[PDB]
Amino acid sequence: AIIQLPKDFQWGVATAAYQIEGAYNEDGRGLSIWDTFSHTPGKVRNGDNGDIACDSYHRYKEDIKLMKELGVDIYRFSISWPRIFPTGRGPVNSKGLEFYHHFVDELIANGIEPMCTLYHWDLPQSLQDIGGWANREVVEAFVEYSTFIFKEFNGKIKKWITINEPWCISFLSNYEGKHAPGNHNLQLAVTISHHLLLAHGKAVKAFRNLGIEGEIGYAPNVEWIEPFSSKQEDQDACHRGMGIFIEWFFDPVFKGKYPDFMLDWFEQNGAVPEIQEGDMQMISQPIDFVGINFYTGSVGRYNKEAGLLEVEKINIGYQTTDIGWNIYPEGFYKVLNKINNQYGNIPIYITENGACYNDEVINGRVKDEGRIEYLKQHLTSIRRSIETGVNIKGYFAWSLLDNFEWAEGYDMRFGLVHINFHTLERTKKDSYYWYKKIVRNRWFE
């Protein structure tokens, strides 16, 4: 069966600063909460950290050459906030600011549009010292940082993401404690989630006010959770299971409200977001597009002992990637429909989609056919979604390079390009060559 993507469909790859850059204490860069966290005993598998990573701070021209051969239209990357403002505020670090000027200019020189994520989890440790995202001064510090970057790049970067995956920044980082800074407190996570939406809306209003050229959105991750049965308790369990990703972070942006079923559930569990007057009006700024990060899904069954949301996620027969995530391309199609039906025809970029497969170099080749199959399946769901009328503009494969995968360290590879983390040698995988052909041909079988 032939799958054909539209002529105007945009192809990209995506990375994040702390995951690839390295040079963590060079050219004036201050520490982030992920520097602190990954050097804390027991927080990252194998004691990995992002001190060196792929060393893409230095080798960014070698990485840009990889992308021109690949043929992508857009490159999604992030800016390290503590590389621009080592303390989060105050004096600009000139070497860090010029690094991204050299990068963006060389990108455009090679014919690649930049898409910039302002915040991809590397909060300056100086700001975490005063409470981090729990402190509304850090929200303001984000606006001032974004404003600096907007003005600094108004000619060159025309696609912008404020906050990447606020669900991870808040709940995964401050309730489950698995990501930096590693707290375990539901009320704190609930309030931090509100502050991230506030930081986003303020960054958006700044973008408008200053008349920056281009378009701006944010990049939530979402899952599809299919009800185990028609029983109401299973329907509600899945409503909650997806609502923590979708309604909780989309309703404030699109409808100016938090969903009542989530508010009531949180309240029964002792948490209420601390909303100050004018917050909701500031959150609900109009955005140009939404970035969807999608990897996985499941079937959900009500179970009173299944965590806070009381939903048991069941693998009813999916393949899994090497990090253990269900492969559920039909869920991808369904979740995009859910979003289109609830929030309208807003433009959508798939700002992340990819698979962990830990395939090694053998005779100079990486035979990662599992990754090719994953990409085929999710690009098929995107084609189905476009035909159903979802306003999908492009696709970013996660990731260009194998990189530092947060609490999993270097052992969980997502790249199209293999990285020897001892030698920093790059090796194009089979999926790189496949993606290259698909980006050019715009069809596959």
mmCIF file of C-alpha atoms in Angstrom, residues 134-368:
data_model
loop_
_atom_site.group_PDB
_atom_site.id
_atom_site.type_symbol
_atom_site.label_atom_id
_atom_site.label_comp_id
_atom_site.label_asym_id
_atom_site.label_seq_id
_atom_site.Cartn_x
_atom_site.Cartn_y
_atom_site.Cartn_z
ATOM 1 C CA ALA A 134 7.278 27.520 41.813
ATOM 2 C CA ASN A 135 8.454 31.151 42.115
ATOM 3 C CA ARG A 136 6.525 33.583 39.926
ATOM 4 C CA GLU A 137 9.714 35.637 39.563
ATOM 5 C CA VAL A 138 11.089 32.756 37.471
ATOM 6 C CA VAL A 139 8.022 33.048 35.233
ATOM 7 C CA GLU A 140 8.864 36.707 34.722
ATOM 8 C CA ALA A 141 12.506 35.787 34.162
ATOM 9 C CA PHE A 142 11.358 33.469 31.344
ATOM 10 C CA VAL A 143 9.482 36.318 29.628
ATOM 11 C CA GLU A 144 12.510 38.607 29.858
ATOM 12 C CA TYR A 145 14.712 35.818 28.491
ATOM 13 C CA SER A 146 12.281 35.035 25.665
ATOM 14 C CA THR A 147 11.978 38.758 24.902
ATOM 15 C CA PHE A 148 15.756 39.068 24.635
ATOM 16 C CA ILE A 149 15.847 36.084 22.268
ATOM 17 C CA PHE A 150 12.887 37.320 20.192
ATOM 18 C CA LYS A 151 14.519 40.701 19.513
ATOM 19 C CA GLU A 152 17.904 39.060 19.013
ATOM 20 C CA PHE A 153 16.604 36.759 16.232
ATOM 21 C CA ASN A 154 13.584 38.594 14.742
ATOM 22 C CA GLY A 155 14.978 38.282 11.224
ATOM 23 C CA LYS A 156 16.193 34.689 11.257
ATOM 24 C CA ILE A 157 13.998 32.400 13.413
ATOM 25 C CA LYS A 158 10.362 32.415 12.275
ATOM 26 C CA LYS A 159 9.008 29.364 14.138
ATOM 27 C CA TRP A 160 9.001 29.375 17.925
ATOM 28 C CA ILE A 161 8.049 26.985 20.728
ATOM 29 C CA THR A 162 7.707 28.404 24.227
ATOM 30 C CA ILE A 163 7.555 25.379 26.564
ATOM 31 C CA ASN A 164 8.364 21.772 25.537
ATOM 32 C CA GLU A 165 6.207 19.129 27.289
ATOM 33 C CA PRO A 166 4.921 21.039 30.360
ATOM 34 C CA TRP A 167 3.607 17.732 31.695
ATOM 35 C CA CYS A 168 7.169 16.509 32.106
ATOM 36 C CA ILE A 169 8.451 19.788 33.597
ATOM 37 C CA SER A 170 5.688 19.779 36.228
ATOM 38 C CA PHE A 171 4.386 16.327 37.133
ATOM 39 C CA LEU A 172 7.257 14.063 36.026
ATOM 40 C CA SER A 173 9.786 16.432 37.636
ATOM 41 C CA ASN A 174 7.979 17.555 40.812
ATOM 42 C CA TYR A 175 5.428 14.855 41.648
ATOM 43 C CA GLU A 176 7.093 11.631 40.487
ATOM 44 C CA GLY A 177 10.565 13.103 40.968
ATOM 45 C CA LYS A 178 12.042 11.259 37.962
ATOM 46 C CA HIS A 179 13.209 14.366 36.071
ATOM 47 C CA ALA A 180 15.076 17.425 37.316
ATOM 48 C CA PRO A 181 14.771 18.922 39.875
ATOM 49 C CA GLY A 182 13.347 15.721 41.360
ATOM 50 C CA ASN A 183 10.644 16.699 43.858
ATOM 51 C CA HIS A 184 7.767 14.516 45.148
ATOM 52 C CA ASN A 185 4.838 16.820 45.914
ATOM 53 C CA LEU A 186 1.531 16.913 44.059
ATOM 54 C CA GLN A 187 0.498 20.443 45.081
ATOM 55 C CA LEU A 188 3.883 21.765 43.939
ATOM 56 C CA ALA A 189 3.554 20.006 40.571
ATOM 57 C CA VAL A 190 -0.014 21.267 40.102
ATOM 58 C CA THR A 191 1.052 24.847 40.791
ATOM 59 C CA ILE A 192 4.164 24.537 38.623
ATOM 60 C CA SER A 193 1.999 23.322 35.724
ATOM 61 C CA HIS A 194 -0.091 26.497 36.036
ATOM 62 C CA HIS A 195 3.049 28.657 36.113
ATOM 63 C CA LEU A 196 4.346 27.055 32.900
ATOM 64 C CA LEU A 197 1.116 27.893 31.098
ATOM 65 C CA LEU A 198 1.391 31.439 32.472
ATOM 66 C CA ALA A 199 5.002 31.667 31.295
ATOM 67 C CA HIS A 200 3.853 30.484 27.858
ATOM 68 C CA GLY A 201 1.031 33.008 27.521
ATOM 69 C CA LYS A 202 3.271 35.854 28.661
ATOM 70 C CA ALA A 203 5.905 34.815 26.126
ATOM 71 C CA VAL A 204 3.186 34.781 23.452
ATOM 72 C CA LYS A 205 1.850 38.235 24.371
ATOM 73 C CA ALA A 206 5.442 39.516 24.244
ATOM 74 C CA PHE A 207 5.914 37.987 20.794
ATOM 75 C CA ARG A 208 2.829 39.858 19.559
ATOM 76 C CA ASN A 209 3.638 43.193 21.258
ATOM 77 C CA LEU A 210 7.118 43.297 19.745
ATOM 78 C CA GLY A 211 5.816 42.344 16.284
ATOM 79 C CA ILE A 212 8.367 39.554 15.902
ATOM 80 C CA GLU A 213 8.152 37.927 12.483
ATOM 81 C CA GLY A 214 6.839 34.398 12.181
ATOM 82 C CA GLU A 215 4.722 32.062 14.284
ATOM 83 C CA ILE A 216 4.676 30.758 17.834
ATOM 84 C CA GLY A 217 3.127 27.915 19.782
ATOM 85 C CA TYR A 218 4.008 25.328 22.413
ATOM 86 C CA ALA A 219 4.704 21.571 22.363
ATOM 87 C CA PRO A 220 2.712 19.374 24.748
ATOM 88 C CA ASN A 221 3.134 15.629 24.670
ATOM 89 C CA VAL A 222 -0.035 13.538 24.434
ATOM 90 C CA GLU A 223 -1.003 9.878 24.635
ATOM 91 C CA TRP A 224 -4.020 7.944 23.399
ATOM 92 C CA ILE A 225 -5.734 5.831 26.054
ATOM 93 C CA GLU A 226 -8.535 3.585 24.724
ATOM 94 C CA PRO A 227 -11.273 2.551 27.200
ATOM 95 C CA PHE A 228 -11.150 -1.092 28.256
ATOM 96 C CA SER A 229 -14.966 -1.207 28.101
ATOM 97 C CA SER A 230 -18.051 0.981 27.758
ATOM 98 C CA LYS A 231 -18.482 0.977 31.563
ATOM 99 C CA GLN A 232 -18.544 4.542 32.852
ATOM 100 C CA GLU A 233 -15.672 4.003 35.307
ATOM 101 C CA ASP A 234 -13.412 2.889 32.415
ATOM 102 C CA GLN A 235 -14.532 5.833 30.279
ATOM 103 C CA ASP A 236 -13.716 8.247 33.106
ATOM 104 C CA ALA A 237 -10.389 6.578 33.920
ATOM 105 C CA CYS A 238 -9.268 7.142 30.314
ATOM 106 C CA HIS A 239 -10.731 10.644 30.334
ATOM 107 C CA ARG A 240 -8.465 11.357 33.319
ATOM 108 C CA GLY A 241 -5.543 9.422 31.835
ATOM 109 C CA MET A 242 -5.565 11.559 28.697
ATOM 110 C CA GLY A 243 -6.866 14.662 30.505
ATOM 111 C CA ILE A 244 -3.596 15.105 32.407
ATOM 112 C CA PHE A 245 -1.898 15.608 29.016
ATOM 113 C CA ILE A 246 -4.615 17.165 26.888
ATOM 114 C CA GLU A 247 -7.472 18.985 28.651
ATOM 115 C CA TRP A 248 -5.247 20.116 31.565
ATOM 116 C CA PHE A 249 -2.758 21.858 29.262
ATOM 117 C CA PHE A 250 -4.994 22.659 26.253
ATOM 118 C CA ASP A 251 -8.193 23.969 27.893
ATOM 119 C CA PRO A 252 -6.378 26.923 29.567
ATOM 120 C CA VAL A 253 -4.697 27.885 26.284
ATOM 121 C CA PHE A 254 -7.718 27.387 24.020
ATOM 122 C CA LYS A 255 -10.752 27.822 26.287
ATOM 123 C CA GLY A 256 -9.329 29.979 29.110
ATOM 124 C CA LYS A 257 -10.297 27.409 31.758
ATOM 125 C CA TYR A 258 -8.990 24.382 33.596
ATOM 126 C CA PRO A 259 -11.168 21.295 33.025
ATOM 127 C CA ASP A 260 -13.527 20.777 35.930
ATOM 128 C CA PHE A 261 -13.210 16.989 36.024
ATOM 129 C CA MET A 262 -9.457 17.314 36.560
ATOM 130 C CA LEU A 263 -9.836 20.163 39.092
ATOM 131 C CA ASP A 264 -12.289 18.078 41.143
ATOM 132 C CA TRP A 265 -10.061 14.986 41.003
ATOM 133 C CA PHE A 266 -7.006 16.984 42.112
ATOM 134 C CA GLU A 267 -9.026 18.633 44.904
ATOM 135 C CA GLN A 268 -10.110 15.256 46.296
ATOM 136 C CA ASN A 269 -6.373 14.474 46.393
ATOM 137 C CA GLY A 270 -5.380 17.679 48.155
ATOM 138 C CA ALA A 271 -4.165 19.935 45.377
ATOM 139 C CA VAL A 272 -5.549 23.106 43.795
ATOM 140 C CA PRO A 273 -3.568 25.263 41.350
ATOM 141 C CA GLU A 274 -2.768 28.649 42.867
ATOM 142 C CA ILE A 275 -4.387 30.868 40.237
ATOM 143 C CA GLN A 276 -3.977 34.632 40.658
ATOM 144 C CA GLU A 277 -6.272 37.211 39.110
ATOM 145 C CA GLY A 278 -5.590 37.837 35.445
ATOM 146 C CA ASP A 279 -3.746 34.503 35.088
ATOM 147 C CA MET A 280 -6.348 32.768 32.907
ATOM 148 C CA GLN A 281 -6.745 35.753 30.592
ATOM 149 C CA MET A 282 -2.963 35.806 30.162
ATOM 150 C CA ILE A 283 -2.719 32.055 29.508
ATOM 151 C CA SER A 284 -5.390 32.047 26.765
ATOM 152 C CA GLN A 285 -3.455 34.126 24.229
ATOM 153 C CA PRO A 286 -4.125 33.033 20.631
ATOM 154 C CA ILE A 287 -1.305 30.911 19.220
ATOM 155 C CA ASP A 288 -0.442 30.233 15.591
ATOM 156 C CA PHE A 289 0.136 26.463 15.853
ATOM 157 C CA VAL A 290 0.431 23.682 18.388
ATOM 158 C CA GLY A 291 3.377 21.317 18.419
ATOM 159 C CA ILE A 292 2.281 17.747 19.138
ATOM 160 C CA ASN A 293 4.804 15.382 20.702
ATOM 161 C CA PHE A 294 3.512 11.809 20.413
ATOM 162 C CA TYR A 295 5.154 8.476 21.153
ATOM 163 C CA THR A 296 2.760 5.994 22.695
ATOM 164 C CA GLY A 297 -0.624 4.929 24.000
ATOM 165 C CA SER A 298 -2.515 2.074 25.606
ATOM 166 C CA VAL A 299 -5.869 0.719 26.751
ATOM 167 C CA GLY A 300 -7.015 2.117 30.103
ATOM 168 C CA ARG A 301 -9.059 0.335 32.781
ATOM 169 C CA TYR A 302 -10.377 1.855 35.997
ATOM 170 C CA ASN A 303 -8.432 0.556 38.998
ATOM 171 C CA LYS A 304 -8.512 2.316 42.368
ATOM 172 C CA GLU A 305 -4.904 1.276 43.115
ATOM 173 C CA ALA A 306 -3.451 2.415 39.747
ATOM 174 C CA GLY A 307 -1.727 5.599 40.793
ATOM 175 C CA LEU A 308 -3.188 9.040 41.387
ATOM 176 C CA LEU A 309 -5.508 8.947 38.360
ATOM 177 C CA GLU A 310 -6.697 5.387 39.129
ATOM 178 C CA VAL A 311 -6.265 4.118 35.568
ATOM 179 C CA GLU A 312 -4.403 0.911 34.735
ATOM 180 C CA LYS A 313 -2.684 1.170 31.361
ATOM 181 C CA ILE A 314 -2.733 -2.172 29.548
ATOM 182 C CA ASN A 315 -0.689 -3.509 26.642
ATOM 183 C CA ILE A 316 -3.434 -5.493 24.876
ATOM 184 C CA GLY A 317 -1.000 -6.663 22.217
ATOM 185 C CA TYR A 318 1.296 -3.848 21.050
ATOM 186 C CA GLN A 319 4.931 -4.201 20.104
ATOM 187 C CA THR A 320 7.215 -2.148 22.360
ATOM 188 C CA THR A 321 10.348 -0.122 21.669
ATOM 189 C CA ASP A 322 13.628 -0.804 23.510
ATOM 190 C CA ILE A 323 12.614 1.718 26.195
ATOM 191 C CA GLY A 324 9.400 -0.238 26.673
ATOM 192 C CA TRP A 325 6.829 2.107 25.115
ATOM 193 C CA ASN A 326 3.775 0.672 23.333
ATOM 194 C CA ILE A 327 3.783 1.162 19.578
ATOM 195 C CA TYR A 328 0.223 2.290 18.842
ATOM 196 C CA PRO A 329 -0.038 4.155 15.526
ATOM 197 C CA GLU A 330 -3.840 3.915 15.481
ATOM 198 C CA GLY A 331 -3.750 5.816 18.790
ATOM 199 C CA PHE A 332 -1.806 8.574 17.023
ATOM 200 C CA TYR A 333 -4.594 8.917 14.466
ATOM 201 C CA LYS A 334 -7.255 8.934 17.186
ATOM 202 C CA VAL A 335 -5.538 11.478 19.437
ATOM 203 C CA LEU A 336 -5.122 13.975 16.583
ATOM 204 C CA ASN A 337 -8.850 13.611 15.893
ATOM 205 C CA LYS A 338 -9.630 14.252 19.553
ATOM 206 C CA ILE A 339 -7.544 17.425 19.482
ATOM 207 C CA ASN A 340 -9.024 18.656 16.191
ATOM 208 C CA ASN A 341 -12.576 18.011 17.419
ATOM 209 C CA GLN A 342 -12.070 19.808 20.761
ATOM 210 C CA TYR A 343 -9.838 22.731 19.760
ATOM 211 C CA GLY A 344 -10.541 23.373 16.075
ATOM 212 C CA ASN A 345 -8.502 23.610 12.897
ATOM 213 C CA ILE A 346 -5.413 25.150 14.483
ATOM 214 C CA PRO A 347 -2.265 24.297 12.479
ATOM 215 C CA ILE A 348 -0.351 21.323 13.880
ATOM 216 C CA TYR A 349 3.279 20.357 13.610
ATOM 217 C CA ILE A 350 4.305 16.955 14.901
ATOM 218 C CA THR A 351 7.233 18.445 16.797
ATOM 219 C CA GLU A 352 8.404 15.042 18.116
ATOM 220 C CA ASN A 353 7.849 11.413 17.096
ATOM 221 C CA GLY A 354 10.416 8.618 17.152
ATOM 222 C CA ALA A 355 11.462 5.337 18.680
ATOM 223 C CA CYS A 356 14.120 3.958 20.992
ATOM 224 C CA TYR A 357 16.036 1.112 19.367
ATOM 225 C CA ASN A 358 19.494 0.359 20.720
ATOM 226 C CA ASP A 359 21.079 -0.927 17.524
ATOM 227 C CA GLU A 360 24.864 -0.951 17.266
ATOM 228 C CA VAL A 361 27.352 -0.343 14.462
ATOM 229 C CA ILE A 362 28.288 -3.578 12.684
ATOM 230 C CA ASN A 363 30.639 -3.382 9.689
ATOM 231 C CA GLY A 364 30.023 0.364 9.569
ATOM 232 C CA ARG A 365 26.246 -0.113 9.261
ATOM 233 C CA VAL A 366 23.341 0.306 11.704
ATOM 234 C CA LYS A 367 20.410 -1.907 10.675
ATOM 235 C CA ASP A 368 17.620 -0.207 12.620
#
